[PDB]
Amino acid sequence: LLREELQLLQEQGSYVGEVVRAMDKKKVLVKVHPEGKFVVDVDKNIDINDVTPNCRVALRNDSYTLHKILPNKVDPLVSLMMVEKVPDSTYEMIGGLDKQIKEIKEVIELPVKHPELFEALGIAQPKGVLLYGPPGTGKTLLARAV
């Protein structure tokens, strides 16, 4: 094993790619970071349903044979969402806004936990919430909190 590393490390590097989506006859469409898209093959050890759209790959460089699935990169919402860095909140930091909590529960909480409860009255569920008042009054932390 240890002598073998002197030999096998002479093998060249592996490309990394990015699946758009697959097409017919065991082929996929993969684009590099700053290098164009390619219609390439798969190896035998990779399943097509295991091939996900929007997923990185290991790629050999000589024939662009598909090598291995590169784990996962990011959600396009977690990424930007984190970039924003909203100050996450909770009920336990609410200072005396209890009826406002009870109102917003009625608009938002109920058509999730009990969507049928409005079919109990034959009325449509609400969709929109307007929140107002002076600034510095808990708008952000309540909205994130819910």
Binding site: E5, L9, Q10, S14, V16, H33, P34, L70
Partner: protein, 70 residues
């Protein structure tokens, strides 16, 4: 016998050394780096590297041709 092979492997870290930057590993001792050429790669690594010296965002060393960790 084995110690003949043991120090023998380090010839690849001769002197024509190009620079990448470590990104992550799939598993033990086989990884993914970000080259100073701009592109990223799935590479192999020298075994004697203390792996716990890795990842602030690690300045690593790549072979210029075989393109693996040095």
């Amino acid at each position: 016998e084995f110690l003949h092979a043991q120090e023998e492997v380090k010839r690849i870290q001769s002197i024509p050394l190009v620079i990448g930057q470590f990104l992550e590993a799939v598993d033990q001792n086989t990884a993914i780096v970000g080259s100073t050429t701009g592109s990223n790669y799935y590479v192999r690594i020298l075994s004697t590297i203390d792996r716990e010296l890795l990842k602030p965002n690690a300045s690593v060393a790549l072979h210029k041709h075989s393109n693996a960790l040095v």
